[model samples]
Target: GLRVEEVVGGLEVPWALAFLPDGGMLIAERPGRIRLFREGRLSTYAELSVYHRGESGLLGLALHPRFPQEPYVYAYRTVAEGGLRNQVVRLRHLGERGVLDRVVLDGIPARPHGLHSGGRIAFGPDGMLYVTTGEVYERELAQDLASLGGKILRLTPEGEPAPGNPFLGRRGARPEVYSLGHRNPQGLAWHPKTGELFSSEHGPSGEQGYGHDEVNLIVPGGNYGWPRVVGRGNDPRYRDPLYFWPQGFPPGNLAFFRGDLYVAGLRGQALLRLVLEGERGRWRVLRVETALSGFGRLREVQVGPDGALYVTTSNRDGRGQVRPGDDRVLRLL
Candidate 1:
């Protein structure tokens, strides 16, 4: 019988999870802690300096693509300073275990005090790193090209703006800007077959019942239409969403596997599977299902190297109900 297995328990507000070359798993806790679980032994490495107020904390993580050779881990955390800016820093391993010796990059704006920092990190197929920056409920900030707030930033491994970005040569614009006009995009996954990006967004409260949330295919230099539209509206200025969920199910973390997309819902508390149809430019959603239910707030979903789906429970982050082992790492096989 197919079942869900508990990989690890007693994880304090686990936000992000990544794997190492030696089959060890690295997990980040919202209290600014990093842990390594290998061979059933979990040990804390270092505590980062983080802004732990409200929804701001240590969020997303990414290991270097050439991790076996470089041995680095990257994190996005909200730092308490002026208006609570979310900072991205890369840590390198020095001793027998994982320990960060330096802070690589800092000084990204968080805006709106202590929430809506879109902290997700992934390496594109072209080797450039892409990170999501929340507008912090500031709608006009999304339209600003010069600010890194509320935009998707493309950068090199060293945190510098990547070459071939859209606004590289434009004056008064942040060169790392990839796309803008996103409210709170939580789920981001790149297609293994087509090398395209896909994003899942959280809709505003006005659309809780009437409007539909979106799942959009990431086209280069495309607008996602956040404040302008909620779902598949007839607005010619922006690209339409490929799929929409009626009655406002909150789509949070995303994973692409076996020509299908698995998105986790924080508000809906279910795992959704979407099947894609047609070619790249034109497509339709063939199916949608609650693949898994009642696993608490589904924060993020990732496919493990062993072909299993991994999920993060978002119960301990002051959001949902936390049981004895409220926050956990769930592996589906």
Candidate 2:
């Protein structure tokens, strides 16, 4: 049995949440603000100018696993560098404030519409930084190895390509590319028990006519068919999704908790729980159901340090019908 408790409200599209040491929290608002919550107070931690368009703006925040010792926080956002683009930057965490440290990666593809800007950042169990990038609506980039779009890129703490990357020695391939052929991947979480990486991605919209959204079991350098394949199928040329929604679940950020995967349903307006089972490198979907339904366009779902689940509503992000307590972070207990 699970229940919900409102943690905070009156937010403008809370994009990502990172739990810090000592019960502190850092949240990114999509329009371009970073807030730090501690001791029953929320204050501005940092601010930066962003494109701030539909589905674009400041997104994705992650803290270093070492936290205070490493003192690094990572962010992915949309910026107007000539046209529109996405970039990953590091910020040095200084108490309740953060300072821009360096640009980890840049020139990722983004359209003027700001759709498909796959902007999620996470530190892998291997101590490497992983980024989810959209194909920028240019489906061709999904299959292109030389480009950074439509890929999950692996990097070092300093932003260089992480060692042992699958394409490190390959010709005409970006060294940072860990996997490719993604549509608009937003969620990245590692299985607590298996350490295998899993992701949630937005699938084709009108091309496939709504609801081809997929959950993928990530394999190094594997080609997940986009513009070429949808859902699980017997395709020898590309890897198939582990599971998918035919009528359009449209999941984004996902987290693994208590041996199951919790996915944020953007349009479904619920929290999805996928029961999984597998061994040795193969996995299966045992059953899938909603953890909590009618939550109003949930976007961010993460495991709090206290072992409870936390989620953010996306009602204000130009999609959902905003209601009382329009945007909030809810703790599931």
Give the number of the best model, judged by lDDT.
2
Q: Can you write out model 1's per-residue Cα lDDT over 200-231, one digit (the tens) per residue?
A: 77666662334376788866556777667667
Off by over 4 Å in 1: 81-83, 101-105, 206-211
Off by over 4 Å in 2: 81-83
Q: What is the overall TM-score of model 1 with all chains considered together? A: 0.93
lDDT of 2 at 289: 84
lDDT of 2: 0.89
Where's the lowest-lDDT run of ten residues in candidate 1?
Answer: 95-104
Residue-by-residue lDDT tens digits, candidate 2, 1-333: 689998988889998999987798998999989898888788998886688886889999998878889889889989885657899988898888998898789889888888889898999899999999998889999899999999999998788999999999989999999999999999999998778899999987896557889999898999999978888778877898878998899986999988888899999998989998887478888999889987789999899989999999999999889998788989998
Residue 28 in candidate 1, Cα distance off native in Å:
1.2
Clash tally for model 1? 1
